[PDB]
Amino acid sequence: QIMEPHDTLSPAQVDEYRKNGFLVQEHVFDEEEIELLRAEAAQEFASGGERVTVEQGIVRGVHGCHLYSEVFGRLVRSPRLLPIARQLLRDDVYVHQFKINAKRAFKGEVWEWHQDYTFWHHEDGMPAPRALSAAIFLDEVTEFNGPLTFVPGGHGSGMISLKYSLDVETMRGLIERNGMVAPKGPRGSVLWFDANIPHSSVPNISPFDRGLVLITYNSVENKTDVTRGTRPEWLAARDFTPLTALQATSF
Amino acid sequence: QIMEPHDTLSPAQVDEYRKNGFLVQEHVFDEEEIELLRAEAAQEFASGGERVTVIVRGVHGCHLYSEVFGRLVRSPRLLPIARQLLRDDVYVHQFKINAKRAFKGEVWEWHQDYTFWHHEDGMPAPRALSAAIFLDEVTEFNGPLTFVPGGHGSGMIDADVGEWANTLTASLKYSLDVETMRGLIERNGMVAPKGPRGSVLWFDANIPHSSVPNISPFDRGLVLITYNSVENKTDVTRGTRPEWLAARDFTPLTALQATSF
Ligand SMILES: O=C(O)CCC(=O)C(=O)O
Numbered sequence: 001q002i003m004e005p006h007d008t009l010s011p012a013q014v015d016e017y018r019k020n021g022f023l024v025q026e027h028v029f030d031e032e033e034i035e036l037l038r039a040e041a042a043q044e045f046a047s048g049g050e051r052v053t054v055e056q057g058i059v060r061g062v063h064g065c066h067l068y069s070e071v072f073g074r075l076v077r078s079p080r081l082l083p084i085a086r087q088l089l090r091d092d093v094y095v096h097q098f099k100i101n102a103k104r105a106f107k108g109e110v111w112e113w114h115q116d117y118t119f120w121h122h123e124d125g126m127p128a129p130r131a132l133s134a135a136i137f138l139d140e141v142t143e144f145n146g147p148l149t150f151v152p153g154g155h156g157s158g159m160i161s162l163k164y165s166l167d168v169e170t171m172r173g174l175i176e177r178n179g180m181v182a183p184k185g186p187r188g189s190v191l192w193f194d195a196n197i198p199h200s201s202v203p204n205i206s207p208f209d210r211g212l213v214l215i216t217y218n219s220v221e222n223k224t225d226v227t228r229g230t231r232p233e234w235l236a237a238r239d240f241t242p243l244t245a246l247q248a249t250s251f
Numbered sequence: 252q253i254m255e256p257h258d259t260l261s262p263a264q265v266d267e268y269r270k271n272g273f274l275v276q277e278h279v280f281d282e283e284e285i286e287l288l289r290a291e292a293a294q295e296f297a298s299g300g301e302r303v304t305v306i307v308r309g310v311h312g313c314h315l316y317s318e319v320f321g322r323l324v325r326s327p328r329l330l331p332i333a334r335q336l337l338r339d340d341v342y343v344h345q346f347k348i349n350a351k352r353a354f355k356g357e358v359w360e361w362h363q364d365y366t367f368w369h370h371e372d373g374m375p376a377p378r379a380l381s382a383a384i385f386l387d388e389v390t391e392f393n394g395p396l397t398f399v400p401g402g403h404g405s406g407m408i409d410a411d412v413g414e415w416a417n418t419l420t421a422s423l424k425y426s427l428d429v430e431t432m433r434g435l436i437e438r439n440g441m442v443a444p445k446g447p448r449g450s451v452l453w454f455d456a457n458i459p460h461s462s463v464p465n466i467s468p469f470d471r472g473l474v475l476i477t478y479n480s481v482e483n484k485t486d487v488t489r490g491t492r493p494e495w496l497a498a499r500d501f502t503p504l505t506a507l508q509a510t511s512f
């Protein structure tokens with residue numbers, strides 16, 4: 001049995017990633033694959049206990065699933081993901097954080113403008129922004145279902161309801177200089193984005209869900225300092241073993 | 252402490268490797284690194300017992316017995332390129348050091364490594380490569396590895412079968428005939444890539460190659476690491492060699508990180 005040989009990004013892709021701070025690959029996973037993930041996500045929302053996050057009673061978010069779900073443990077080692085994380089971080093990699101964020105049809109909240117790295121640096125002791133997130137589209141992402149929205153190029157000046165958010169004025173400057181972009185794509189796409197890229201999102205006014213599986217890969221050299229770490233393991237990993245790719249076996 | 256971020260080949264370098272079947276990177280390792288490797292090689296020649304072939308001709312399997320060599324094969328100078336060219340996680344199928352000393356050395360008849368690994372070890376496909384670290388400058392005169400460029404583009408070429416293969420004999424179990432070769436050479440030519448001490452020569456599992464005697468006052472030490480795709484792991488059921496010739500532990504390799512020791 002055979003996995004397709006590892007595909008990596010082209011130089012133009014890598015360049016576009018580094019310059020914009022994000023990149024969309026369309027149609028990485030097929031419908032049946034996405035449906036397996038959606039089904040597993042539903043189980044995790046149902047069984048995740050303290051790892052779940054609610055609509056302030058509908059389970060809207062879950063953390064750490066790759067530690068508790070075999071499906072999600074294998075997803076993070078997928079040959080569609082791991083080789084690109086290695087390529088873009090230029091190292092062996094591990095999962096710093098895993099979360100699933102669902103914005104249900106006609107539901108959802110404003111996520112204020114923030115940089116993930118600010119949080120990881122201060123709360124988890126991540127020493128440099130040598131990390132990224134892969135957002136898997138469980139549903140088509142459109143103008144109207146609360147897409148992640150970024151400042152392109154905004155990762156490039158380093159680190160500027162949520163504990164750390166970016167004020168009116170610091171954001172105005174960024175946006176005046178760089179603009180705002182909400183990347184779109186079909187179900188099964190992957191959105192790669194820099195640990196330090198500012199982003200925000202709005203409620204979903206569409207009649208369709210917007211589920212995202214968000215895998216944060218970190219460089220092994222860039223491992224967090226667990227002595228300055230606050231959070232439990234399902235928020236901020238502590239096992240820095242380099243991930244290996246899944247191979248095609250008989251089961 | 253910091254390892255330089257992993258360097259991979261440019262797309263022009265990859266294209267040249269896939270077209271020619273080989274590629275040289277100059278000056279990968281510095282002098283001091285090379286000297287560490289040279290001293291460990293001398294330790295392996297002295298202590299390798301049955302793993303040495305005989306001047307001492309070469310030693311096999313050293314990454315399983317030497318910590319220095321076990322680290323080398325995980326080097327961030329090597330591993331990320333092996334993964335990139337094989338499009339997979341990788342492991343070491345075989346590790347050898349071929350001495351070839353000054354004014355000495357022996358003819359290495361024409362062969363394709365994959366012919367051996369396929370028949371002797373049960374390698375299923377040629378999704379493997381070798382990285383040859385130059386312990387000494389490689390010149391026209393010290394018996395360089397020589398290739399038919401593009402000669403890997405037709406798979407194994409039929410070979411008369413001694414009866415454990417060992418690439419470290421003058422007389423090889425699977426050589427290519429003066430007539431099979433004449434045609435190949437006529438058609439594609441011959442190239443003996445050169446380079447400074449510390450360079451790495453990458454070459455395809457299926458590229459035909461050979462070398463001649465060293466006629467120089469200069470040794471031509473090579474550390475040859477054969478990386479195989481994890482998916483392409485050998486069938487240990489049809490394997491005929493000990494582990495120090497053909498690996499059986501297919502664990503994916505991870506890159507060395509910079510530690511305080
Ligand atoms: O799902 C969203 O729209 C925002 C999520 C986000 O940026 C985060 O979890 O850091």
Ligand SMILES: O=C(O)CCC(=O)C(=O)O
Binds near residue numbers: 395461
């Ligand atoms: O060291 C040499 O000259 C050639 C070695 C070789 O091709 C092999 O060992 O398969």
Ligand SMILES: [Fe+3]
Binds near residue numbers: 114115116199
């Ligand atoms: Fe975020």
Ligand SMILES: [Fe+3]
Binds near residue numbers: 362363418
């Ligand atoms: Fe050979």
